[PDB]
Design a protein around this ligand. Structure first.
Ligand SMILES: COc1ccc(S(=O)(=O)N2CCc3ccccc3C2)cc1NC(=O)Cc1n[nH]c(=O)c2ccccc12
Ligand SMILES: COc1ccc(S(=O)(=O)N2CCc3ccccc3C2)cc1NC(=O)Cc1n[nH]c(=O)c2ccccc12
Ligand SMILES: [Mg+2]
Lengths: 449, 448, 449, 458
């Protein structure tokens, strides 16, 4: 234990900890979840403190020797060497002040090892406030999770779904509407639908990026930029864009909206919620198609990990969590007051978790489920050919009444419509075998080649 | 009190009604909510039936006499002349087939009044299925609601907020963070923030239009187009765009996705929910600013309709409704199976209600609350003159070190920056009283 | 099109409208949804005004002739005679003061026609405020909906599920876990699970009644009872109980909690949301059981209204709406300030609609779906007797290696496990035909009563 | 590291790991959240495995030396000694079978260190299945969180709010409706409302326990009890109640409902969501009451807990109401996830258990922890600005009403007008208009304008 102090007085701190007194106060004040900032959030805070020290150096506001020590410690934090030094709960002051101070105190302690004296709030927090730094880090983490992780993961799932659409282009089967037998489709067509749902999901994430990428940096305490250079924002963003390659990061269109609200996180959660909705439909269909092996639909076989549909269950459970996280994000989003929205840590936890779950589960689903599905091709075609649904094209030749008798007999004898029409002696007067084969071609009915 | 014949018995229908037997069976099957389709949904079904008859006539599949009569009846339906011939509950067969058949039967009856006999299914439902029609009318209605009603209403609200941001550009007041006294801002700056939130809301709606506008029409029963002309979708969409002026209506990118899912309504509801979140923050700040006149902030006076903030209460209640509607839409969205999402009538009721509530309340908020707000300028300035100050704007007069000493002593002795500079005997050749006041001026601190 | 004079100016009021100037201004101020109060809310406002006039008369505060006029007018409103006289939008002032005034004006106008002059405020609103009346009417309406309408409807559905569970006691079929074939159950056992879900739903509704039936009446503007008799609450409640027979109605435990919050509505919506969850599971299984007639499960046939499962679709759509309404109620619930929660009309619309939809859809589901279901008995037994899941009790006789071979051949050749064991020549000293029959007794494996 | 053999080949496992092959496959199959079971779930799985081995011994199905070794290992898990041996993701197979096998394997590995061979499946999973175990452990954990932790934390907040209600019994202030000035109340009355909200919240938790405490144990794979003793459920329950003292644990009313659905978790989340709604109203009113101290309401002062700002050095923030409102938001989100998993079961099994368990147990923990912090570090230390509140109440136009019968509603309205315009008290404005006289004495006025009497405190 070692003694430290802040504006309010003196505080006991673990002796070998890189954090200081404000972080220690926050440890004692918020033992709520036992969970702190994620690696992506810590990395974001590191990048931002580095970019801030760079621009403060560039405007000759910060001595070069201090800027260099900050930039080196900030590199260390962005790299992941210091996660053990961020012990503050997610459920902290709603501005993220506490985690901002955590980053400043940890950076000061790293520089102190290299023999450089930094003041956490006069050097490491120079030209900044808690109010604009913690939301900036949150939007950097979210932008990076959308562009570098989620979109590529959904592109891999899209590609696995589109590959199946192609492989299964002629695998004709019974359509189902309302869960009841309908006119024919192909597994390919169904998988082209699933592929479109994920491609549309990528379009929805891309459409939110012009507002997700907005950074509050330079707005200071209330959005006015008081105590910061007038161009602090555009300079810090230019450093982050050059360092990350994330061209989507940009200065806020309005510095007050960017601090009074987190509407860009609510907007983004909407896209993730819509993806969760798409993945629920895709995973449900796939587990139903794999159902059996005797009493279910037995259309396809899932790869093993009689196989339980374990990846569909993970996907549907992840979707349920994204929906829950979405409601929490919208709740925090609505409840800002005046110059600041004080639900940032909670909203940050939820949107970053939704990004991570959808990313990881989309890759596992694509690789370990979609890629290895095998279709019961001949069985699917036999059912499609034996369905009362395909008798309609026969009504003009044999009449409604006889069409109905053919469907009833085909079902009762478990035979194809073709073999029932022959069995009933309808060939000859009503139509020829050539006519029957044209009318009952289930692949032509599916309007596939 | 006319009696009709159904293939499972007899059906008594009201004599003034234009619907027939299938619609009456649906009236009897689903007495759940006692609410039917809204005007918007009736209109879109009319628009769709007129367009389908036009293309069926153009392809020579439908005798022009019959097409003409369908087109005439459909135009009446689209023009709101029959909003009382659609008695089927919202909570019906999940394809919306019942409401589809309701539209077919009303058109048949209207045509019969002008001497033309139409079969509801073979003529009025020609080239269509029971599964591609109701989702098409739903996306027509939602696209029209977004483009012709919501976006203009939000633009009216944006423009009222932006007008106030300009009026109040130099109306200094105290900032509040965590509800606690903060450095100065202007009422103008806060309104510029509100205006940007509504502008971002319009951008959010605009961004969903490429998917909201996708129509299933031509996909038929399962998305394959069986029993429809190969170009039915593209030709119908072209007629609908021509008649409505809605360039946002488009053929589905994937005919299977367009019927297996309603992801477009889920996406759109997300934009409306975000708008509802923005509107809550704006309405809440405005009622708080008008709070009192004695026990509140008393920053502004709302127009009187001791004024209760009735329009902020209507806005926040609408917002709550849009959040609930949004949960219902997503729930229906997720629960499709194979070739058909069967939550369409419930998802339609919820998205179209969210569009209508946000449109109506945004116009009312803009016109009957925002436009008439008056600022208590002298009160606001007195709050600004009570905000914390910073020593930074003294740096050039006393130096980092003295300024640092001023901040420390102000904090320790719980004094203002201004009084601490005076008490330390800093007034003199280096800093006059005029200079200290100009350096710490509250409007300058707001950096307007 | 008759004319009324208002302080603000003249106001035109429709001819056969019983409302006055304040209601007309509200119609002009809030054109938002075009939907007004529901029949239950209007009846509750009538009930409350009658009981308030009865008590003001009993205490000597109101002339008997004025009290008699109010009680007669209020009875007509509570009888559903004036549902067209409440034109104000749900999205009105959040206390519901506009609707309270609407009731006062309608009563004054009904009394005017009988030669009695009532001041809407001074007489019909005597001892009441603008804030304790509308929530009192909401809680009366909700308590009545729960006790008189929803519980009976749920009891009807319970008894239909229980009746099917009894009729299907020995209808052995293949269990399903993860949608995959599992050891046997009966249709009866599954229906007994659905019955319990609905019985537990009735328990959930009964459990919230102690707080749902709490009435704010007598609290006046802020909960203190200023401007009302000290015993007004207990007196009006005693009249409402004696008149309606709703013993669940009670004074609020705390007069400030009853006006500052609508927590009892949020609690009740949670019970309705749980029922919506139970109904989703029941309706989804039932439509899945009736899927076919060829490519689906084909366990049961639903009665007509190849039959589409239209009532399970109505049920699952109602469940979605109840879930959405539940989210709106909680949102309004959380957002009260100080002495008053100003989301009452929105919360009232959503709770009373959830009660109505569940009541109506439960009765339709019980009568037109559940009562008429018919099981494919012989077919269910044949699949149960043909399932690889049931070979485990052969292990002690022929070994788990030979038992796996029997399972694989039964499935490939679409034969019963019994016929496959015989076909493979396993009958003999290690296994008698009677021993095989005991081992593969699928109904015994289900362990029904 | 150390090699093992599954029936799908060879698996590598951390050396100082007590889990075996199947847990390591699950670690490889499901890298989704990087978050595993919580301490309460692990303890519950320990309690259940020990109760099952006791009953299997009692019924003579499991050799006493095997049962004692499971009981000893299961007690180590329930005591929290092996909280690092459960690496499987929450986002696993929907039954919880992976986490069930994790428990069986860690128990087998603990017993091997003492010279006893346990087959994870045949001995540690005896009479149980892959489907009635995990939901049993979830309901144990959730019942224990409700009765042992949340209800006492709520009672502590209730008691802190009630003590303020009593201390502020006579602290008169203006009421606020629609955020506008209203007739007088006391700060004590408002706090009595907050107290009643938390008390009702405890009633709401109590009312769910008869169904939250229902255990699936003994139902086996599909709810029929096949491969288990007919009375396995009542016997395991009898042991769990005797050992834990948790009287709320009971065998399910219907064995199919208990595995096909998790409606008890949905029901309990509704109670927690209602508490989150109450806490939102209480915390929002409290931060507003403490707002300012110069530009806000300044009704009360919150105890200081850390510095708020560097730019504005002396600024102190309502950090505990902020933590409470954020926890509330998380409970509402978690509640939507639980209901979604709840509705989506199929036939004999609801396969959303691990996700529903994570969300309900977290809601219980956040509400417990934040309720105690709120009671101790915020409510207990609140101070009222008594003179400020009384001044506003004595100057309120709302209090002129009881002058009606003495001077007329018109003259009363002029007193309000004048007092409001000239920033004076109603009592002084009435004197300043020469109203004191024959029909209104100076003590009659003091009696009529008694603002505490107008609050009507019991
Ligand atoms: C999950 O659906 C199934 C699962 C397995 C099997 S199987 O290959 O193992 N199988 C077992 C039954 C059987 C009976 C006679 C001849 C051959 C067979 C072969 C069939 C089915 N469905 C059907 O038998 C469909 C069916 N057809 N025709 C009917 O009249 C009928 C009546 C009621 C329900 C369904 C139907
Ligand atoms: C919805 O599941 C079904 C629907 C209909 C029918 S039916 O009665 O109309 N029918 C069609 C198939 C058939 C084949 C030979 C002899 C008779 C029949 C009769 C069967 C089924 N299920 C099955 O055929 C189940 C099945 N059993 N054995 C297998 O190896 C297998 C392999 C792949 C997929 C499924 C399975
Ligand atoms: Mg004040």
């Amino acid at each position: 234990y070692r003694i430290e102090h802040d504006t309010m007085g003196e505080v006991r701190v673990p002796a070998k900890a890189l954090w200081r007194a404000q972080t220690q106060r926050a440890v004692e004040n918020f033992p709520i979840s036992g969970r702190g900032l994620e690696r992506t959030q810590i990395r974001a805070l590191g990048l931002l403190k580095g970019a801030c020290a760079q621009v403060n150096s560039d405007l000759g506001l910060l001595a070069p020797e201090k800027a260099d020590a900050i930039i080196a410690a900030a590199a260390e934090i962005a790299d992941g060497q210091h996660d053990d030094q961020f012990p503050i709960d997610v459920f902290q002051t709603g501005s993220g002040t506490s985690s901002n101070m955590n980053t400043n105190e940890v950076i000061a302690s790293i520089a102190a090892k290299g023999g450089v004296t930094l003041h956490p709030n006069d050097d490491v927090n120079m030209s900044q406030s808690s109010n604009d730094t913690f939301p900036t880090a949150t939007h950097i983490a979210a932008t990076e999770a959308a562009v570098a992780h989620l979109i590529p993961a959904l592109q891999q799932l899209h590609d696995a779904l589109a590959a199946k659409a192609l492989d299964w282009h002629t695998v004709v089967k019974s359509g189902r509407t309302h869960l009841m037998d309908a006119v024919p489709v192909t597994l390919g067509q169904e998988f082209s639908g699933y592929a479109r749902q994920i491609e549309a999901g990528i379009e929805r994430v891309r459409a939110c990026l012009p507002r997700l990428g907005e950074l509050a940096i330079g707005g200071t305490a209330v959005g006015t930029g008081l105590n910061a250079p007038d161009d602090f924002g555009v300079r810090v963003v230019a450093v982050l864009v050059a360092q990350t390659g994330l061209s989507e990061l940009r200065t806020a269109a309005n510095s007050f909206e960017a601090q009074a609200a987190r509407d860009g996180l609510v907007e983004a959660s909407g896209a993730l919620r819509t993806i969760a909705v798409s993945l629920t439909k895709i995973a449900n269909d796939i587990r139903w198609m794999g159902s059996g092996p005797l009493t279910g639909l037995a259309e396809i076989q899932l790869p093993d990990l009689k196989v339980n549909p374990v990846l569909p269950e993970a996907v549907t459970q992840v979707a349920a969590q994204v929906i829950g996280n979405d409601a929490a994000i919208a709740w925090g989003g609505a409840n800002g007051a005046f110059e600041l929205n004080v639900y940032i840590p909670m909203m940050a936890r939820n949107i970053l978790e939704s990004f991570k779950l959808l990313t990881n589960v989309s890759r596992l689903f694509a690789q370990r489920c979609i890629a290895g599905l095998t279709a019961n091709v001949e069985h699917l075609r036999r059912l499609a050919e034996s369905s009362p649904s395909i008798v309609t094209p026969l009504n003009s030749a044999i009449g409604y009444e006889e069409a109905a008798a053919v469907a009833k007999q085909a079902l009762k004898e478990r035979k194809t419509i073709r073999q029932t029409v022959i069995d009933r002696g309808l060939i000859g007067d009503r139509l020829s075998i050539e006519d029957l084969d044209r009318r009952l071609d289930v692949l032509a009915m599916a309007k596939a080649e």
